[PDB]
Structure 1
Amino acid sequence: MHISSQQHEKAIKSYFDEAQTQGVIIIKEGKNLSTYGNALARANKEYVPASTFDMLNALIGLENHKATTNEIFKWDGKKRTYPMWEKDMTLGEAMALSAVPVYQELARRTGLELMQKEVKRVNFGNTNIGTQVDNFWLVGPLKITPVQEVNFADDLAHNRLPFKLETQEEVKKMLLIKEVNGSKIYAKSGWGMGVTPQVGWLTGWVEQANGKKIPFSLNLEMKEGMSGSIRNEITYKSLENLGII
């Protein structure tokens, strides 16, 4: 409580400065939105959601019975970009591994028509998915702002999205990435590689010991030959600098 806001700002900026990237982390305490980082103006610019869209993809899928919690999506046995994707998995493992081929399977089962209306219903980002049901979150035209992303995380953390409570829980249980100091961090990472320049995301929330939920959204530029870890390390440093974890 004794650290100056000036100091918080400078430390969080330096986290981004030390990664030699440009980015912003938005944090929501209650209804108050706070913007940090070394590139504050990214806050209301639009980027592709990339794998962040998996969270909505899973909500849509599960709500409309295109899959279940336990269903095993079989690997077709073709080569994948990463060897860890060359196995059979649930939605939940696909979420942790960011296995897009699974989420494309789920997008295909949902179908363009049902995807468009469901993404209009949820009012996610710019809400346009175009005509290609299997890559619209990767190369456009679906885009969203860091502010919009943290508000979606807030919505999801609090069960406010227009989906069943069981659906929202099922997807939330897939999102645990770290336990720290009796705080749980639930989030989804994102690395849009099919856009110039590349966008990195880590969107989610901290659930504190006491019970309050603190949504955040990190968003930065990835320069190829940069580690995906940086998204986590910057987020964790920021949340700890602000005493959120």
Structure 2
Amino acid sequence: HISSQQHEKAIKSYFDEAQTQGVIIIKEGKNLSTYGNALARANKEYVPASTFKMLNALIGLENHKATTNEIFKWDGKKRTYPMWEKDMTLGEAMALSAVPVYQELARRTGLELMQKEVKRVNFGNTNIGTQVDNFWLVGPLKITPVQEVNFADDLAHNRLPFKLETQEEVKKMLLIKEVNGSKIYAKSGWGMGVTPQVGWLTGWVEQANGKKIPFSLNLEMKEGMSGSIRNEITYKSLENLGII
């Protein structure tokens, strides 16, 4: 029906119109497809930012540093956003991307265990340095858009080296949208403590027929830019390709 040239032009325009540079890697089966207006970003390293929360959650749950029902109490100190000044579960913190909750979880895990677990799952360059509570925000941990879809691919198919239940627990925390029988599971990310700033939206679409299609949107964020563009560009691309 529609030509590859046309799909590539449309996706590229989604990034052009947002006035940013980015790429969206789609994985169908074992085949990777790169779309966007800056394809060379596919194999470049960037901090994972909040997308790391997926692995942070897997590690904490596997090593019993928390349960899926445990309420992390707000300590009462001012936080960057009012929505974060409340008591929440890992799952609510994932949806709100509440860094404080995941920094606490990382501290429970501890530097030694964290470095060992990141090495074991082979996430990005696997280096977390010496600060257990911010390595995914300002370095030294980095990962490429290609490694992100592959990580998303593994999780969606329960192939990561964690118990089946642990992966299922975390996957339930990532449902962000339902469209015509398709479910989108994803984690957004936005590293503001780095220059240039990087935006993410990694995950997968589960189609009605059960097929899972992983993706990874990666672009440069600019001050005065709405975080929802990550989602809007992802949805329009997924739709344009007929994925959802």
Per the shorter chain, which TM-score range?
over 0.9
The DSSP-based 3-state class of the residue aligned with 1:26 is strand
The DSSP-based 3-state class of the residue aligned with 1:138 is helix
Q: Which residue of 1 aligns with 2:149?
A: 150
Counting matched residue pairs gives 244
| Pairwise CA distance, 1:244 | 0.2
Q: Which residue of 2 aligns with 1:31?
A: 30
| Pairwise CA distance, 1:193 | 0.5
| Pairwise CA distance, 1:35 | 0.1
For 1:7 and 1:87, the matched residues in 2 are separated by 46
For 1:40 and 1:118, the matched residues in 2 are separated by 31
| Pairwise CA distance, 1:32 | 0.3
| Pairwise CA distance, 1:36 | 0.2
For 1:122 and 1:87, the matched residues in 2 are separated by 32
RMSD across aligned positions (CA): 0.2
Identity value in percent:
100
| Pairwise CA distance, 1:152 | 0.0
For 1:167 and 1:33, the matched residues in 2 are separated by 27
The DSSP-based 3-state class of the residue aligned with 1:137 is helix
1:27-51 deviation per Cα after TM superposition (whole angstroms, max 9, x unaligned): 0000000000000000000000000
| Pairwise CA distance, 1:150 | 0.3
For 1:70 and 1:4, the matched residues in 2 are separated by 48
| Pairwise CA distance, 1:135 | 0.2
Q: Which ranges in structure 1 are unaligned for 5 or more consecutive residues?
A: none
| Pairwise CA distance, 1:151 | 0.2
For 1:114 and 1:88, the matched residues in 2 are separated by 26
For 2:30 and 2:103, the matched residues in 1 are separated by 34
For 2:135 and 2:144, the matched residues in 1 are separated by 16
Q: Which residue of 2 aligns with 1:234?
A: 233
| Pairwise CA distance, 1:59 | 0.1
Q: Which ranges in structure 2 are unaligned for 5 or more consecutive residues?
A: none
| Pairwise CA distance, 1:13 | 0.1
1:109-160 deviation per Cα after TM superposition (whole angstroms, max 9, x unaligned): 0000000000000000000000000000000000000000000000000000
The DSSP-based 3-state class of the residue aligned with 2:151 is helix
Runs of 4+ in 1 over 3 A off after TM superposition: none
For 1:225 and 1:86, the matched residues in 2 are separated by 24
For 2:3 and 2:223, the matched residues in 1 are separated by 35
